[PDB]
Design a protein around this ligand. Sequence first.
Ligand SMILES: [Cl-]
Ligand SMILES: [Cl-]
Ligand SMILES: [Gd]
Ligand SMILES: [Gd]
Ligand SMILES: [Gd]
Ligand SMILES: [Gd]
Ligand SMILES: [Gd]
Ligand SMILES: [Gd]
Ligand SMILES: [Gd]
Ligand SMILES: [Gd]
Ligand SMILES: [Gd]
Ligand SMILES: [Gd]
Ligand SMILES: [Gd]
Length: 258
Amino acid sequence: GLVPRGSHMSGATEACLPAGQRKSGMNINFYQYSLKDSSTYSNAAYMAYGYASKTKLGSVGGQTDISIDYNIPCVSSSGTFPCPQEDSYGNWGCKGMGACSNSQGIAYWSTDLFGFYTTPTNVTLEMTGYFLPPQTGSYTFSFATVDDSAILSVGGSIAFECCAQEQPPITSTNFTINGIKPWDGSLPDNITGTVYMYAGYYYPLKVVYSNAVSWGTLPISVELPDGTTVSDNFEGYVYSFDDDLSQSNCTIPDPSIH
Ligand SMILES: [Cl-]
Ligand SMILES: [Cl-]
Ligand SMILES: [Gd]
Ligand SMILES: [Gd]
Ligand SMILES: [Gd]
Ligand SMILES: [Gd]
Ligand SMILES: [Gd]
Ligand SMILES: [Gd]
Ligand SMILES: [Gd]
Ligand SMILES: [Gd]
Ligand SMILES: [Gd]
Ligand SMILES: [Gd]
Ligand SMILES: [Gd]
């Protein structure tokens, strides 16, 4: 065969070749989410697009460092310091700080999430951008843990539409990683999803993340085809492009034959 046959029954993930000015990093949009609401974020429709029906709080662009690790304050005898969740104890104190005088169950304001001043105790955020694979092959994305609820989607018409990064969210619930908080209360660590990607094509990437109370955590990694792992800092891998809905050739439905 002069040419490759193509992935079977058009199984290839859709990718993009945006012709505009590339910008390092992902865009982060922040949306309202109610303190102690442990039900809203348990719905697939909400995590895919419904989040954007709530008040938009703000945004920051150009973010390459994308893992979430938010610790609430312990108001202690020696001042106010963030408590690592594993160091919290009793009712309650923080190891090396003694007893904390403040409630675990109120809203707290902080710039910890990408420098945006908001309430990381209770918020939903949407990260959008394009993932640029340097190598052709299988990529395994993972969340080490999820506190409270999250999804990761990769691909044109799954994350968002090519050359349309800034548009309202699409409705696809075909998540690459489903880390939605179960109604039943369950859910395990190191949750994963794999995508076969072709080098030099730009793959739409969406992460939606929500927290209702206190600590928030979402450590994001990808394992490359060469078996190495990139964690937290995706510099060199993730990019944004301004919308160009007029770029006719932007969508590549099958990179395996393009
Ligand atoms: Cl603090
Ligand atoms: Cl202590
Ligand atoms: Gd980080
Ligand atoms: Gd950092
Ligand atoms: Gd942090
Ligand atoms: Gd931070
Ligand atoms: Gd920090
Ligand atoms: Gd940080
Ligand atoms: Gd589409
Ligand atoms: Gd939480
Ligand atoms: Gd491996
Ligand atoms: Gd860090
Ligand atoms: Gd724009």
